[PDB]
Amino acid sequence: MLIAIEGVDGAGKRTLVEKLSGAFRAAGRSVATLAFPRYGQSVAADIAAEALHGEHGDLASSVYAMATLFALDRAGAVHTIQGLCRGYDVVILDRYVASNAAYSAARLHENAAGKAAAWVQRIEFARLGLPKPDWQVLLAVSAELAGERSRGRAQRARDNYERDAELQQRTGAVYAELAAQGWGGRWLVVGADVDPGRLAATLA
Amino acid sequence: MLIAIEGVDGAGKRTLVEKLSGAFRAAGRSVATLAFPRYGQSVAADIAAEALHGEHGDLASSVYAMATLFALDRAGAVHTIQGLCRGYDVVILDRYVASNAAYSAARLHENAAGKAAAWVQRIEFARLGLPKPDWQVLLAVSAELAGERRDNYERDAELQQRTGAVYAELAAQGWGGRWLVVGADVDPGRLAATLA
Ligand SMILES: Cc1cn([C@H]2C[C@H](O)[C@@H](CO)O2)c(=O)[nH]c1=O
Ligand SMILES: Cc1cn([C@H]2C[C@H](O)[C@@H](CO)O2)c(=O)[nH]c1=O
Numbered sequence: 001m002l003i004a005i006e007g008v009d010g011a012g013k014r015t016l017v018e019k020l021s022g023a024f025r026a027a028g029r030s031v032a033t034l035a036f037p038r039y040g041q042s043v044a045a046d047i048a049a050e051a052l053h054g055e056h057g058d059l060a061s062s063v064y065a066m067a068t069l070f071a072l073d074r075a076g077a078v079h080t081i082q083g084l085c086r087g088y089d090v091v092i093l094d095r096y097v098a099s100n101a102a103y104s105a106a107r108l109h110e111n112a113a114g115k116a117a118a119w120v121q122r123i124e125f126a127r128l129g130l131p132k133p134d135w136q137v138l139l140a141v142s143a144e145l146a147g148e149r150s151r152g153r154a155q156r157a158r159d160n161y162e163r164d165a166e167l168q169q170r171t172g173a174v175y176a177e178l179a180a181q182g183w184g185g186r187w188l189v190v191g192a193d194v195d196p197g198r199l200a201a202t203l204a
Numbered sequence: 205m206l207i208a209i210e211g212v213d214g215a216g217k218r219t220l221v222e223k224l225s226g227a228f229r230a231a232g233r234s235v236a237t238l239a240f241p242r243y244g245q246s247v248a249a250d251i252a253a254e255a256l257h258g259e260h261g262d263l264a265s266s267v268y269a270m271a272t273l274f275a276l277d278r279a280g281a282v283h284t285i286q287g288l289c290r291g292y293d294v295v296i297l298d299r300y301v302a303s304n305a306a307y308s309a310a311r312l313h314e315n316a317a318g319k320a321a322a323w324v325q326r327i328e329f330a331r332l333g334l335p336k337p338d339w340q341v342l343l344a345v346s347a348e349l350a351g352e353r354r355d356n357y358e359r360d361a362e363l364q365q366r367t368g369a370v371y372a373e374l375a376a377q378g379w380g381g382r383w384l385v386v387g388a389d390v391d392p393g394r395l396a397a398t399l400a
Contacts, residue, residue: 043279043331047272057268057312057320064261065269068251072276075247119261128247 001029001089001204002081002131004096006175007139008168009161010149012192016139017094023200024090032084035094037073045073052159060160063107067100067120075128082131090204097124098136098178103161106170112177121184135203136187138179143169206289206335207399208300211343212368213358214350216388217298220343227392228294231400236288239298241277249277256355264356271308271324279332289335301328302340302374307357310366316373325380339399340383342375344368
């Protein structure tokens, strides 16, 4: 059971992951989680994160270069993911391939029918052979609320993606299209106040 | 000993690799060779090559993105390079880290003492852990000659010229270590003796 949690920055995905982990365990299922990008576990991921903070010259200016780095981070995680799928009943991922499709498309002002989303699919699933997720869960949230989380959980720093209010808005919209068309597999759209117990009963 | 053969497209690096290898062997030393990018061997390399042929959207438009891909390709070869260095007296690399510094600086119209060349050193040697070469041998060729003897880089003549110019300065400034500049007519025996 591979489950990917998706959503814009500040959507509160960690929380959902935690609450979902609990509900699955209470139901007698073993759970392991993994978050992408794998900061500290991938140079590709670390360089990508630093680039979003203005480092590494013109790296972040290229939409496909950034998508590639995130895709290569996941590629070096293929074994880790498979290992978790064998060691646990449910594997929960905080962000996965659809993050790349949603953000790359939004950065290019494209929708789900654009080249970037199709490119992401070919590269990650068909070429890098990343495991297709059984369920992709979109945590839909208020754009204002999500944006405030970023401004708050920081000024208490936001990278180039987090500061781009319009990018976040378009990402949420592409996410909705992906979910609607079952991009990459079966999706489930949930809200913040979603019930963990039923969510887990629904997914499994 | 780790030796890197550097030069622009059409320098004749493969030929020099064979000659130098032949000379070291005759001198009673075991030699192993490796070439970069490791086309067909790593995703980073293939994506980079493809991007140079117009694939992958705006990937190639980013100098640091292309550089990062070639660096990540070498990063995947670290275990291979270390193995070769443990089993052979001399390891000769056809293109190495300096290639990234030269092409990146050239695309940005920077020089050997620039930011990109410094970035390449910070990233590849320290962060990625690529062994620094004992010698970097530049098979220098003028733009005129190179022009005499097909991706986005290959087709860009001004880029090739500027890359040659940066290589010449990297060598003169001892970027990342000791350099030797040689021509296609260099005597293998003397070269091998100089490097020994
Ligand atoms: C994992 C991942 C994150 N991102 C974005 C979301 C954030 O702004 C940031 C780190 O999670 O990068 C992608 O664009 N693609 C990806 O594949
Ligand atoms: C190995 C390497 C090659 N290149 C260039 C040279 C050619 O145009 C092509 C393949 O060798 O890419 C780099 O820009 N950086 C590198 O690190």
